[PDB]
């Protein structure tokens, strides 16, 4: 039917949108501290401490095959990444540190995507 096609061609707006917001998420990490998996290989115990890892190219893959479908589910993947860091890593840690300037520094890029995903009417 067309409108699956409209509502298909929405959601390829959505990911367009949010593949620029996952852009811009990312370079506020220069240290790429969130770019990959934790490693289960050099920290075995992980998976006994969080039981929902995330990371930014885990968010990448499922943002190409368009499997966000609102900015809400994003959102819930960025803040695992963070709010995983900052329970797994101690305060005085360069992990626990970079994850709270990830978090006040990305909070601004969110606050325009969500006005903008509702002006524009993507979701």
Excluded: W
């Excluded at 929902?52 to 695992?80: I, S, V």
């Excluded at 900052?86 to 325009?112: C, E, H, I, S």
């Amino acid at each position: 039917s067309m409108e699956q096609v409209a509502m298909e061609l929405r959601l390829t707006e959505l990911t367009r949108l949010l593949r620029s917001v996952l852009d811009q998420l990312q370079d506020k990490d220069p240290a790429r501290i969130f770019a990959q998996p934790v490693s289960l290989k050099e920290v075995p115990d992980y998976l006994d401490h969080i039981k929902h890892p995330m990371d930014f190219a885990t968010m990448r893959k499922r943002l190409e095959a368009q499997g966000y479908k609102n900015l809400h589910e994003f959102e819930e993947d960025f803040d695992l990444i963070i709010d995983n860091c900052m329970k797994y890593n101690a305060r005085d840690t360069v992990f626990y540190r970079a994850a709270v300037r990830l978090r006040d520094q990305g909070g601004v890029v969110l606050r325009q995507a969500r006005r903008e995903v509702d002006s524009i009417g993507l979701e």
